[PDB]
């Protein structure tokens, strides 16, 4: 039902990232580009609870960036809302996630998405 | 007999391409691809099992003119895999294939995919020739390379460079395909002193 | 031939004279008109045909980027299917004079890194591309893409 | 040496070859391997093995035979279209899955 419950079921029964993608499609008929539903926010919240991120939900977010499920703008905003900064491991994970899409950073959509990418940068 | 050769060759290419054309798990990709190549090799072995020594070479000229008469590069590479397994299994003497491949007048540098696949196959099968045959092959490969202009297109240059790896393999000193004195004698007969 | 030859010899003797049809008229029209009476009482559409017939898995659209309304055309497709996982969008460059030649798949190696699964997708896709016959369509590329995604799901699990 | 050659009769020159092998641990089970031979003094031409994936029906072999017999008519048509150079999209599943 909620995105938190779907991600958490994906953590409970060990789902590989593509099986997570399929079952995430099946749980939600309207895709809504997954950014209306804030996939990046929920994945970052339930990945960055420990002192070190659990590699499962980070694998889910890295697949959801490398495959184009989630726009770069929602990821950059959800990265921007983290701070805390006392943990170096979560910060290094966020910088590897930024190392994925940065230098590429190419929106192919409406101009409002490009303005959103500007504000997100 | 010429008609027999024509029939076997036509049917092998058409059949192998078309059954593989529809990929309904017909095949397992790793070494079963090698087994389909074995299948063309066996069809070639049956065809060869019926010929005299003096007639050993005119059929090979027909084979290479039929391969070079093709247009689809997948068809050409499938018949070159057939010729490679026909040499590798010991059925064919590995000097007639190389000579009739290079001395074929359809082998021009403008047929760049044919150029690349041909010189790839000669790189595969040159390791078994005796040294005098390697010397004559060196001469005819240099004379084939000599027909390229000073300037060619920027896309065809890598497929043209497939002859350079055959040349680098022959003139390699550790591989010892032939005495290196023979190699420099053929070269200096073709590029005498003062010629770039 | 037989029973008709002297007509053929006369007419083939007298071609290239500018008064030829005058001669035929004067020698033939009064007999015929006496007996028979007087005379009588942006995007090339092949690609629209392909795209209009595609399965609703694919969602083919034109690139916002790239030259438009000129020789070659450029496509960014998609993939929607509950069975298949979400994958990188795929970029196609269809030449002008599209049939009698094969379209080209714009390769993006960098997004097919950073996962094992997308690496398997890419390896299997290049394999089926080498397996393809020449002068294939767009739909052959799209179907090898979907079959590649399916094999990379099965090989992984 | 334990094989079974199933010739298709609507289109000859096509054989499905079942090879039966013993699974090593289970002594009361068999393992099947399905090959696809084609034939021209008859000669073999090629072989490919199919992918793996009251029980006396063996549903997989019936499926492979039906699949070959409904698909292989299109391969000759694909070749005869290509010899007259009519551009076509390839043999495709059409709309629903069952065509």
Coordinates of C-alpha atoms in Angstrom, one line a residue:
Chain A
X1 CA 0.0 0.0 0.0
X2 CA 2.4 2.7 1.1
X3 CA 5.8 3.0 -0.5
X4 CA 7.5 2.4 2.8
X5 CA 5.6 -0.9 3.2
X6 CA 6.5 -2.0 -0.3
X7 CA 10.2 -1.2 0.2
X8 CA 10.1 -2.9 3.6
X9 CA 8.5 -6.0 2.2
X10 CA 11.3 -5.9 -0.4
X11 CA 13.8 -5.9 2.4
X12 CA 11.9 -8.7 4.4
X13 CA 11.9 -11.3 1.7
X14 CA 15.2 -10.8 0.0
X15 CA 14.4 -9.4 -3.4
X16 CA 17.0 -8.7 -6.0
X17 CA 16.7 -5.3 -7.6
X18 CA 15.0 -6.4 -10.8
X19 CA 12.5 -8.5 -8.9
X20 CA 12.0 -5.4 -6.8
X21 CA 11.4 -3.4 -10.0
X22 CA 8.8 -5.9 -11.2
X23 CA 7.0 -6.1 -7.9
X24 CA 7.1 -2.4 -7.5
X25 CA 5.4 -2.1 -10.8
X26 CA 2.8 -4.6 -9.8
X27 CA 2.0 -2.9 -6.5
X28 CA 1.3 0.4 -8.2
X29 CA -0.7 0.5 -11.5
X30 CA -0.2 4.2 -12.1
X31 CA 3.6 4.7 -12.4
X32 CA 3.3 8.6 -11.9
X33 CA 7.0 8.5 -13.1
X34 CA 7.6 7.3 -9.5
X35 CA 8.6 10.9 -8.5
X36 CA 5.1 11.9 -7.6
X37 CA 5.1 9.0 -5.2
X38 CA 8.6 10.1 -4.0
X39 CA 10.6 6.8 -4.5
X40 CA 13.9 8.5 -3.8
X41 CA 12.7 10.0 -0.5
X42 CA 11.4 6.7 0.9
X43 CA 14.5 4.8 -0.3
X44 CA 16.8 7.3 1.3
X45 CA 14.9 7.3 4.5
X46 CA 14.9 3.6 4.9
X47 CA 18.4 3.3 3.7
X48 CA 20.0 5.9 5.9
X49 CA 18.7 4.9 9.3
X50 CA 21.7 2.9 10.5
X51 CA 25.2 4.2 10.9
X52 CA 26.0 2.4 7.7
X53 CA 23.4 2.1 4.9
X54 CA 22.0 -1.3 4.3
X55 CA 23.3 -2.4 0.9
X56 CA 19.9 -3.8 -0.2
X57 CA 18.0 -0.5 -0.3
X58 CA 21.1 1.3 -1.7
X59 CA 21.1 -1.4 -4.5
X60 CA 17.4 -0.5 -5.0
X61 CA 18.2 3.2 -5.4
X62 CA 21.2 2.6 -7.6
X63 CA 19.1 0.5 -9.9
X64 CA 16.3 3.1 -9.8
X65 CA 18.8 5.7 -11.0
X66 CA 20.7 3.6 -13.5
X67 CA 17.5 2.4 -14.9
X68 CA 15.5 5.5 -15.5
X69 CA 12.7 4.9 -13.0
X70 CA 13.5 8.0 -11.0
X71 CA 14.5 11.4 -12.3
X72 CA 17.7 13.0 -11.3
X73 CA 15.9 15.9 -9.8
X74 CA 14.0 14.0 -7.1
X75 CA 17.2 12.2 -6.2
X76 CA 19.1 15.4 -5.9
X77 CA 16.4 17.0 -3.7
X78 CA 16.2 13.9 -1.5
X79 CA 20.0 13.9 -1.2
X80 CA 19.8 17.6 -0.2
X81 CA 17.4 16.9 2.6
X82 CA 19.7 14.6 4.6
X83 CA 22.5 16.5 6.4
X84 CA 23.0 15.0 10.0
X85 CA 26.6 14.7 8.7
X86 CA 27.9 12.9 11.8
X87 CA 28.2 9.7 9.9
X88 CA 30.8 9.5 7.2
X89 CA 29.6 6.3 5.8
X90 CA 26.1 7.5 4.8
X91 CA 27.7 10.7 3.4
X92 CA 30.1 8.6 1.3
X93 CA 27.2 6.5 0.0
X94 CA 25.4 9.7 -1.0
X95 CA 28.5 10.9 -2.8
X96 CA 28.7 7.6 -4.7
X97 CA 25.1 8.0 -5.7
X98 CA 25.9 11.6 -6.9
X99 CA 28.9 10.2 -8.7
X100 CA 26.5 8.0 -10.7
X101 CA 24.5 10.7 -12.4
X102 CA 26.6 13.8 -12.2
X103 CA 28.5 14.8 -15.4
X104 CA 25.5 13.3 -17.2
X105 CA 22.6 15.1 -15.7
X106 CA 20.4 15.1 -18.8
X107 CA 16.7 15.7 -18.4
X108 CA 14.7 14.6 -21.4
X109 CA 11.2 15.9 -20.6
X110 CA 9.2 19.1 -20.1
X111 CA 11.0 22.4 -19.4
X112 CA 9.5 22.4 -15.8
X113 CA 11.6 19.2 -15.2
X114 CA 14.6 21.1 -16.5
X115 CA 13.9 24.0 -14.1
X116 CA 13.5 21.4 -11.4
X117 CA 16.9 20.0 -12.3
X118 CA 18.3 23.5 -12.1
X119 CA 16.9 24.1 -8.6
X120 CA 18.1 20.6 -7.7
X121 CA 21.6 21.3 -8.8
Chain B
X1 CA 30.4 -33.0 -59.3
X2 CA 30.6 -29.2 -59.7
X3 CA 26.8 -29.2 -59.4
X4 CA 27.1 -31.5 -56.4
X5 CA 29.4 -29.0 -54.7
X6 CA 27.0 -26.2 -55.5
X7 CA 24.1 -28.0 -54.0
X8 CA 25.8 -29.0 -50.8
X9 CA 27.2 -25.5 -50.2
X10 CA 23.8 -23.7 -51.0
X11 CA 21.8 -25.9 -48.8
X12 CA 24.2 -25.6 -45.8
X13 CA 24.2 -21.8 -45.8
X14 CA 20.5 -21.4 -46.3
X15 CA 19.5 -24.0 -43.7
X16 CA 21.9 -23.0 -40.9
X17 CA 21.0 -19.3 -41.3
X18 CA 17.2 -19.8 -41.3
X19 CA 16.8 -22.2 -38.5
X20 CA 19.0 -19.9 -36.4
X21 CA 17.1 -16.9 -37.9
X22 CA 14.2 -17.7 -35.5
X23 CA 15.7 -17.8 -32.0
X24 CA 13.1 -20.1 -30.2
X25 CA 15.7 -21.4 -27.8
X26 CA 16.6 -23.5 -30.9
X27 CA 20.2 -23.1 -29.6
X28 CA 22.2 -23.1 -26.4
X29 CA 24.8 -20.2 -27.2
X30 CA 28.3 -21.2 -25.7
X31 CA 29.8 -24.3 -27.4
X32 CA 26.5 -25.4 -29.0
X33 CA 27.3 -22.5 -31.4
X34 CA 30.6 -24.4 -31.9
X35 CA 28.4 -27.6 -32.5
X36 CA 26.4 -25.8 -35.3
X37 CA 29.8 -24.9 -36.7
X38 CA 30.7 -28.7 -36.3
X39 CA 27.4 -29.4 -38.2
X40 CA 28.6 -27.2 -41.2
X41 CA 32.1 -28.9 -40.9
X42 CA 30.4 -32.4 -41.2
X43 CA 28.4 -31.3 -44.2
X44 CA 31.8 -30.1 -45.8
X45 CA 33.5 -33.4 -44.7
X46 CA 30.8 -35.5 -46.5
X47 CA 31.2 -33.3 -49.6
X48 CA 35.1 -33.7 -49.5
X49 CA 34.9 -37.5 -48.9
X50 CA 34.4 -37.8 -52.6
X51 CA 37.3 -36.3 -54.6
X52 CA 40.6 -36.9 -56.2
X53 CA 43.9 -35.2 -55.4
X54 CA 44.4 -33.4 -58.7
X55 CA 40.8 -32.1 -58.4
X56 CA 41.6 -30.9 -54.9
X57 CA 42.1 -27.2 -55.8
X58 CA 39.6 -26.2 -58.5
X59 CA 36.7 -27.0 -56.1
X60 CA 38.4 -24.8 -53.5
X61 CA 38.6 -22.0 -56.0
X62 CA 34.9 -22.6 -56.6
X63 CA 34.3 -22.5 -52.8
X64 CA 36.1 -19.2 -52.3
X65 CA 34.4 -17.6 -55.4
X66 CA 31.1 -18.7 -54.0
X67 CA 31.9 -17.3 -50.6
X68 CA 33.2 -14.0 -52.1
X69 CA 30.1 -13.9 -54.4
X70 CA 27.9 -13.6 -51.3
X71 CA 26.7 -10.3 -49.9
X72 CA 25.5 -11.0 -46.4
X73 CA 28.4 -10.9 -44.0
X74 CA 26.8 -13.4 -41.7
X75 CA 26.6 -15.8 -44.6
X76 CA 30.3 -15.2 -45.3
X77 CA 31.3 -15.6 -41.7
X78 CA 29.3 -18.8 -41.5
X79 CA 31.0 -20.3 -44.5
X80 CA 34.4 -19.1 -43.2
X81 CA 33.7 -20.9 -39.9
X82 CA 32.9 -23.9 -42.1
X83 CA 36.2 -23.6 -43.8
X84 CA 38.0 -23.0 -40.5
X85 CA 36.6 -26.3 -39.0
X86 CA 37.3 -28.0 -42.3
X87 CA 41.0 -27.1 -42.0
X88 CA 41.1 -27.7 -38.2
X89 CA 39.7 -31.2 -38.4
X90 CA 42.5 -32.2 -40.8
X91 CA 40.3 -32.6 -43.8
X92 CA 41.9 -29.8 -45.8
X93 CA 45.6 -29.0 -46.4
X94 CA 46.1 -25.6 -44.8
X95 CA 47.9 -24.0 -47.7
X96 CA 45.4 -24.3 -50.6
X97 CA 42.7 -22.5 -48.5
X98 CA 45.0 -19.6 -47.7
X99 CA 46.4 -19.3 -51.3
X100 CA 42.9 -19.5 -52.9
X101 CA 41.6 -17.0 -50.3
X102 CA 44.2 -14.3 -51.0
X103 CA 44.7 -14.9 -54.8
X104 CA 41.0 -14.6 -55.4
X105 CA 40.5 -11.5 -57.5
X106 CA 37.2 -10.7 -55.7
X107 CA 39.2 -9.9 -52.6
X108 CA 39.6 -6.2 -53.1
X109 CA 40.1 -3.6 -50.3
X110 CA 36.7 -2.0 -51.1
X111 CA 35.0 -5.1 -49.9
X112 CA 36.0 -4.2 -46.4
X113 CA 33.9 -6.7 -44.4
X114 CA 35.1 -9.5 -46.8
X115 CA 38.6 -8.1 -46.3
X116 CA 38.4 -8.2 -42.6
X117 CA 36.8 -11.7 -42.3
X118 CA 39.2 -13.1 -44.9
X119 CA 42.3 -11.9 -43.2
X120 CA 40.9 -13.0 -39.8
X121 CA 40.6 -16.5 -41.1
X122 CA 44.1 -16.5 -42.6
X123 CA 45.4 -15.3 -39.2
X124 CA 43.6 -18.3 -37.7
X125 CA 44.8 -20.9 -40.2
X126 CA 48.3 -19.7 -41.1
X127 CA 50.0 -21.4 -38.2
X128 CA 50.1 -24.8 -39.9
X129 CA 51.6 -23.9 -43.2
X130 CA 55.2 -24.9 -43.9
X131 CA 57.7 -22.2 -44.2
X132 CA 58.0 -21.9 -48.0
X133 CA 54.3 -21.5 -48.2
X134 CA 54.4 -18.9 -45.5
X135 CA 57.0 -17.1 -47.6
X136 CA 54.8 -17.1 -50.7
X137 CA 51.8 -16.0 -48.6
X138 CA 53.9 -13.2 -47.2
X139 CA 54.6 -12.1 -50.8
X140 CA 51.0 -12.2 -51.9
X141 CA 49.8 -10.5 -48.7
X142 CA 52.3 -7.6 -49.2
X143 CA 51.2 -7.3 -52.8
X144 CA 47.5 -7.2 -51.7
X145 CA 48.3 -4.5 -49.1
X146 CA 50.2 -2.5 -51.8
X147 CA 47.0 -1.7 -53.7
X148 CA 45.5 0.5 -51.0
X149 CA 45.7 4.2 -51.7
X150 CA 47.5 6.7 -49.6
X151 CA 44.2 7.9 -48.3
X152 CA 41.1 5.8 -47.5
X153 CA 38.0 6.5 -45.5
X154 CA 38.2 6.8 -41.7
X155 CA 35.7 4.1 -41.0
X156 CA 37.2 1.4 -43.2
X157 CA 40.7 1.8 -41.7
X158 CA 40.2 -0.7 -38.9
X159 CA 38.8 -3.4 -41.1
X160 CA 41.6 -2.7 -43.5
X161 CA 44.1 -3.1 -40.7
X162 CA 43.3 -6.8 -40.4
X163 CA 46.0 -7.7 -42.9
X164 CA 48.5 -5.9 -40.6
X165 CA 48.0 -8.5 -37.9
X166 CA 48.7 -11.3 -40.3
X167 CA 51.9 -9.4 -41.3
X168 CA 52.8 -8.9 -37.6
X169 CA 52.2 -12.5 -36.9
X170 CA 54.4 -13.7 -39.8
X171 CA 57.3 -11.3 -39.0
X172 CA 57.1 -12.1 -35.3
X173 CA 60.4 -13.6 -34.1
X174 CA 59.1 -15.7 -31.2
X175 CA 56.4 -17.4 -33.1
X176 CA 59.1 -18.7 -35.6
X177 CA 56.8 -19.5 -38.6
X178 CA 59.7 -19.2 -41.0
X179 CA 63.4 -18.2 -40.9
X180 CA 63.5 -14.4 -40.6
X181 CA 66.0 -14.2 -43.4
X182 CA 63.3 -15.3 -45.8
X183 CA 61.0 -12.6 -44.5
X184 CA 63.5 -9.8 -45.0
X185 CA 64.4 -11.2 -48.4
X186 CA 60.8 -11.0 -49.6
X187 CA 60.4 -7.6 -48.1
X188 CA 63.6 -6.2 -49.6
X189 CA 62.6 -7.7 -52.9
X190 CA 59.4 -5.7 -52.7
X191 CA 60.7 -2.5 -51.0
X192 CA 64.3 -2.0 -52.2
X193 CA 66.7 0.4 -50.7
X194 CA 65.4 3.9 -50.9
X195 CA 61.7 3.1 -50.9
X196 CA 59.4 3.8 -48.1
Chain C
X1 CA 6.9 -13.9 -89.2
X2 CA 5.2 -16.2 -91.7
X3 CA 2.4 -14.6 -93.7
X4 CA 3.2 -11.3 -92.2
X5 CA 6.8 -10.6 -93.2
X6 CA 6.5 -8.0 -96.0
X7 CA 4.7 -5.6 -93.8
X8 CA 7.4 -6.0 -91.2
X9 CA 10.1 -5.3 -93.9
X10 CA 8.3 -2.2 -95.1
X11 CA 7.8 -0.7 -91.7
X12 CA 11.3 -1.5 -90.4
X13 CA 12.7 -0.1 -93.6
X14 CA 10.9 3.2 -93.1
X15 CA 11.5 4.1 -89.5
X16 CA 13.2 7.5 -88.7
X17 CA 11.6 9.3 -91.6
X18 CA 9.8 12.4 -90.1
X19 CA 7.0 11.8 -92.6
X20 CA 6.4 8.2 -91.4
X21 CA 3.2 8.6 -89.6
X22 CA 1.9 10.7 -92.5
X23 CA 2.6 7.7 -94.7
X24 CA 0.8 5.3 -92.4
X25 CA -2.1 7.7 -92.1
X26 CA -2.5 8.2 -95.9
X27 CA -2.2 4.5 -96.6
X28 CA -4.4 3.1 -93.8
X29 CA -7.0 5.6 -92.4
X30 CA -9.5 5.7 -95.4
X31 CA -9.9 1.9 -95.4
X32 CA -10.4 1.7 -91.7
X33 CA -12.7 4.8 -91.5
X34 CA -14.8 3.4 -94.4
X35 CA -15.2 -0.1 -92.8
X36 CA -15.0 0.6 -89.1
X37 CA -16.8 3.9 -89.2
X38 CA -15.5 7.1 -87.7
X39 CA -13.2 6.8 -84.6
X40 CA -14.0 6.7 -80.9
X41 CA -17.3 7.9 -79.4
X42 CA 7.9 14.7 -42.9
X43 CA 8.6 11.4 -41.3
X44 CA 8.7 8.6 -43.9
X45 CA 5.5 6.6 -43.9
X46 CA 7.3 3.3 -43.6
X47 CA 8.2 4.3 -40.0
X48 CA 4.7 5.4 -39.3
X49 CA 3.5 2.0 -40.5
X50 CA 6.0 0.3 -38.2
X51 CA 5.1 2.4 -35.2
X52 CA 1.4 2.1 -35.7
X53 CA 1.7 -1.7 -35.6
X54 CA 3.8 -2.1 -32.5
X55 CA 2.9 -4.0 -29.4
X56 CA 1.8 -1.8 -26.5
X57 CA 4.9 -2.9 -24.6
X58 CA 6.9 -0.4 -26.6
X59 CA 6.2 3.3 -26.3
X60 CA 8.3 4.7 -29.2
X61 CA 8.6 8.5 -29.3
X62 CA 10.9 10.9 -31.2
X63 CA 14.0 12.4 -29.4
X64 CA 13.4 16.0 -28.3
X65 CA 17.2 16.4 -29.2
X66 CA 18.7 15.6 -32.6
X67 CA 17.9 17.0 -36.1
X68 CA 14.2 16.7 -37.1
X69 CA 12.2 16.7 -40.4
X70 CA 15.5 15.8 -42.3
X71 CA 17.0 12.6 -43.8
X72 CA 17.5 10.4 -40.7
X73 CA 15.2 10.2 -37.7
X74 CA 16.0 9.4 -34.1
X75 CA 13.8 7.5 -31.6
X76 CA 13.8 7.0 -27.8
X77 CA 11.6 4.0 -27.2
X78 CA 10.6 2.7 -23.6
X79 CA 9.5 -0.6 -22.2
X80 CA 6.3 -1.4 -20.2
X81 CA 5.5 -4.9 -19.2
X82 CA 4.7 -6.3 -15.7
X83 CA 6.9 -9.4 -16.5
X84 CA 9.9 -7.4 -17.6
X85 CA 12.0 -5.0 -15.3
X86 CA 12.4 -1.2 -16.0
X87 CA 15.5 -0.8 -18.2
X88 CA 17.5 2.1 -19.9
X89 CA 15.3 3.8 -22.6
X90 CA 17.3 2.7 -25.8
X91 CA 18.2 5.1 -28.7
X92 CA 17.7 4.3 -32.3
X93 CA 18.9 6.1 -35.4
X94 CA 16.8 5.2 -38.5
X95 CA 18.3 6.3 -41.8
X96 CA 16.5 7.8 -44.6
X97 CA 15.8 5.2 -47.3
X98 CA 14.9 3.0 -44.3
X99 CA 14.0 -0.3 -46.0
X100 CA 16.9 -2.0 -48.0
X101 CA 19.2 -1.0 -45.1
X102 CA 19.5 -1.7 -41.3
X103 CA 18.8 1.0 -38.6
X104 CA 21.5 1.6 -36.0
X105 CA 21.4 1.2 -32.2
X106 CA 23.0 4.2 -30.5
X107 CA 25.2 2.5 -27.9
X108 CA 25.4 3.9 -24.4
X109 CA 27.8 1.7 -22.5
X110 CA 28.0 4.0 -19.4
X111 CA 24.4 3.4 -18.3
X112 CA 24.6 -0.3 -19.0
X113 CA 27.4 -0.4 -16.4
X114 CA 26.8 0.1 -12.6
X115 CA 24.7 -3.1 -12.3
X116 CA 25.3 -6.8 -13.1
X117 CA 21.8 -7.1 -14.5
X118 CA 22.1 -4.3 -17.0
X119 CA 25.5 -5.7 -18.0
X120 CA 23.8 -9.0 -18.8
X121 CA 21.1 -7.2 -20.7
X122 CA 23.8 -5.5 -22.7
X123 CA 25.9 -8.6 -23.4
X124 CA 22.9 -10.6 -24.5
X125 CA 21.6 -7.7 -26.7
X126 CA 24.9 -7.3 -28.5
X127 CA 24.9 -11.1 -29.1
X128 CA 21.4 -11.2 -30.6
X129 CA 22.4 -8.1 -32.7
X130 CA 25.3 -10.1 -34.1
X131 CA 22.8 -12.9 -34.7
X132 CA 20.4 -10.7 -36.7
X133 CA 20.0 -10.9 -40.5
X134 CA 20.9 -7.9 -42.5
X135 CA 18.3 -5.2 -43.5
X136 CA 16.2 -5.9 -40.5
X137 CA 13.4 -3.7 -39.3
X138 CA 13.0 -1.5 -36.3
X139 CA 10.7 -4.1 -34.7
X140 CA 13.5 -6.7 -35.0
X141 CA 15.7 -4.5 -32.9
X142 CA 12.9 -3.8 -30.4
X143 CA 12.0 -7.5 -30.1
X144 CA 15.7 -8.5 -29.7
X145 CA 15.7 -5.9 -26.9
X146 CA 12.7 -7.4 -25.2
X147 CA 14.1 -11.0 -25.6
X148 CA 17.4 -9.8 -24.3
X149 CA 15.7 -8.4 -21.2
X150 CA 13.9 -11.7 -20.7
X151 CA 17.0 -13.8 -21.0
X152 CA 18.8 -11.6 -18.6
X153 CA 16.0 -12.0 -16.1
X154 CA 16.1 -15.8 -16.6
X155 CA 19.9 -16.2 -16.6
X156 CA 20.1 -14.2 -13.3
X157 CA 17.3 -16.3 -11.8
Chain D
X1 CA 22.6 -44.7 -27.9
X2 CA 19.2 -44.1 -26.3
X3 CA 17.6 -41.6 -28.6
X4 CA 14.4 -41.1 -30.5
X5 CA 14.1 -39.4 -33.9
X6 CA 10.8 -37.7 -34.5
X7 CA 10.4 -36.7 -38.1
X8 CA 8.0 -33.9 -38.9
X9 CA 5.8 -35.0 -41.8
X10 CA 4.2 -31.8 -42.9
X11 CA 7.7 -30.6 -43.5
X12 CA 10.4 -33.3 -43.8
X13 CA 14.1 -32.5 -43.5
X14 CA 13.3 -31.7 -39.9
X15 CA 13.9 -34.0 -37.0
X16 CA 13.5 -33.6 -33.2
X17 CA 15.9 -35.8 -31.4
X18 CA 15.3 -36.9 -27.9
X19 CA 18.3 -38.2 -26.0
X20 CA 17.5 -39.9 -22.7
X21 CA 20.2 -39.9 -20.0
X22 CA 20.4 -41.2 -16.4
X23 CA 20.3 -38.6 -13.7
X24 CA 23.1 -39.8 -11.4
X25 CA 21.6 -39.8 -7.9
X26 CA 18.0 -40.6 -8.6
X27 CA 17.9 -44.1 -10.1
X28 CA 14.2 -44.0 -11.1
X29 CA 14.2 -40.7 -13.0
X30 CA 15.3 -39.8 -16.5
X31 CA 16.7 -36.6 -18.0
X32 CA 15.7 -35.6 -21.5
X33 CA 17.7 -33.6 -24.0
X34 CA 16.0 -32.2 -27.1
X35 CA 17.9 -31.5 -30.3
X36 CA 16.8 -30.1 -33.6
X37 CA 18.4 -31.8 -36.6
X38 CA 17.9 -31.0 -40.3
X39 CA 18.7 -33.4 -43.1
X40 CA 19.4 -33.6 -46.8
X41 CA 22.9 -41.4 -48.2
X42 CA 21.1 -38.7 -46.1
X43 CA 23.4 -36.2 -44.4
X44 CA 23.1 -34.4 -41.1
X45 CA 23.2 -30.6 -41.4
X46 CA 22.9 -28.9 -38.0
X47 CA 22.0 -29.4 -34.4
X48 CA 20.9 -27.1 -31.6
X49 CA 19.8 -28.0 -28.1
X50 CA 16.7 -26.4 -26.6
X51 CA 16.8 -24.7 -23.3
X52 CA 15.8 -26.7 -20.2
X53 CA 13.3 -24.2 -18.7
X54 CA 0.1 -39.5 -13.8
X55 CA 3.3 -37.8 -15.2
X56 CA 3.3 -40.1 -18.3
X57 CA 2.5 -37.4 -20.8
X58 CA 5.9 -35.5 -21.2
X59 CA 4.3 -32.1 -21.9
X60 CA 7.6 -30.6 -23.0
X61 CA 8.1 -32.8 -26.0
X62 CA 4.6 -32.2 -27.2
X63 CA 5.1 -28.5 -26.8
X64 CA 8.4 -28.6 -28.8
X65 CA 6.8 -30.6 -31.6
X66 CA 3.8 -28.3 -31.8
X67 CA 6.1 -25.2 -31.7
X68 CA 8.3 -26.5 -34.5
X69 CA 5.4 -27.5 -36.7
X70 CA 3.6 -24.1 -36.4
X71 CA 6.7 -22.0 -36.5
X72 CA 8.8 -23.6 -39.3
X73 CA 6.4 -22.8 -42.1
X74 CA 7.3 -19.1 -41.6
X75 CA 11.0 -19.7 -42.1
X76 CA 10.6 -20.8 -45.7
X77 CA 8.3 -17.8 -46.3
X78 CA 10.9 -15.5 -44.8
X79 CA 13.6 -16.8 -47.2
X80 CA 11.3 -16.6 -50.2
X81 CA 10.4 -13.1 -49.3
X82 CA 14.0 -12.2 -48.9
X83 CA 15.0 -13.6 -52.3
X84 CA 12.6 -11.2 -54.0
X85 CA 13.7 -8.4 -51.6
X86 CA 10.3 -7.5 -50.2
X87 CA 11.1 -5.6 -47.0
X88 CA 9.4 -7.1 -44.0
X89 CA 9.6 -7.1 -40.3
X90 CA 10.6 -10.5 -39.2
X91 CA 8.5 -13.4 -38.0
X92 CA 6.8 -11.9 -35.0
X93 CA 4.3 -12.9 -32.3
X94 CA 1.2 -10.9 -33.3
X95 CA -0.7 -9.1 -30.6
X96 CA -1.9 -11.9 -28.4
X97 CA 0.8 -14.4 -27.7
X98 CA -0.8 -17.3 -29.6
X99 CA -0.1 -16.4 -33.2

